[PDB]
Amino acid sequence: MQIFVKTLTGKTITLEVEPSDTIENVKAKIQDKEGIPPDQQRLIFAGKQLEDGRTLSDYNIQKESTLHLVLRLRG
């Protein structure tokens, strides 16, 4: 199924996922597609940061839902 991700840089991308995909599987797909390393990613939906072990279905994230990506920034 298709979902959307709005990156930190403001870019809206499409991603092909399954309901049973874990958040980590989804981070990895963002890496494959945009080069953003999974350990910097904070995925947000419905004002909630999503947790690595859980799945899209747990958060009732249905097809065509839009996640927001914010990055952990350090230096």
Partner: protein, 156 residues
């Protein structure tokens, strides 16, 4: 132009914006030491009078105090995963990197807004509900470094 910023609330207390501008057109950049404390140096530069290369110790103290009240509830702490005690030991460590985690906690502890401009600007991340004119503005570059920003007088 600075009034035109479009901030999207993503999660409690945190906003993102994607304006397009030259940092130098609107800000003076106050470079901070290339040690591991640049984040705290930057905060100190913008918050503390008669600031020195040692002033950052105080920001780190406020960060400790902030974590004790906010760390367990901080969404970004989940990427740390550490308990409150192990995180503190590491945070307080010599030359340790600050980050958006500390920024979020400090914003609440100091009662300020902190804006982090990650670079030409790629995006801004705002911690706090204030606007850029009242905010503590930081410049994040190289994915490894923070400097302080001050709005140029003509735009103040």
């Amino acid at each position: 132009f600075l009034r035109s910023l479009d901030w999207t609330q993503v999660i409690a207390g945190q906003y993102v914006s994607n304006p397009r501008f030259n940092i130098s057109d609107y800000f003076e950049i106050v470079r901070q030491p290339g040690d591991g404390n640049c984040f705290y140096h930057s905060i100190a530069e913008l918050t503390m009078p008669n600031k020195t290369d040692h002033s950052y110790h105080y920001i780190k103290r406020l960060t400790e105090s902030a974590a004790r009240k906010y760390y367990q509830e901080e969404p970004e702490a989940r990427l740390v995963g550490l308990s409150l005690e192990d995180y503190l030991k590491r945070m307080l460590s010599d030359n340790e990197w600050g980050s958006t985690l500390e920024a979020s906690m400090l914003a609440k502890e100091m009662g300020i807004t902190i804006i982090i401009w990650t670079v030409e600007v790629e995006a801004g991340i705002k911690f706090g509900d204030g606007d850029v004119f009242t905010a503590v503005n930081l410049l994040h570059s190289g994915q490894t470094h923070f400097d302080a920003l001050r709005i140029l007088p003509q735009f103040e």
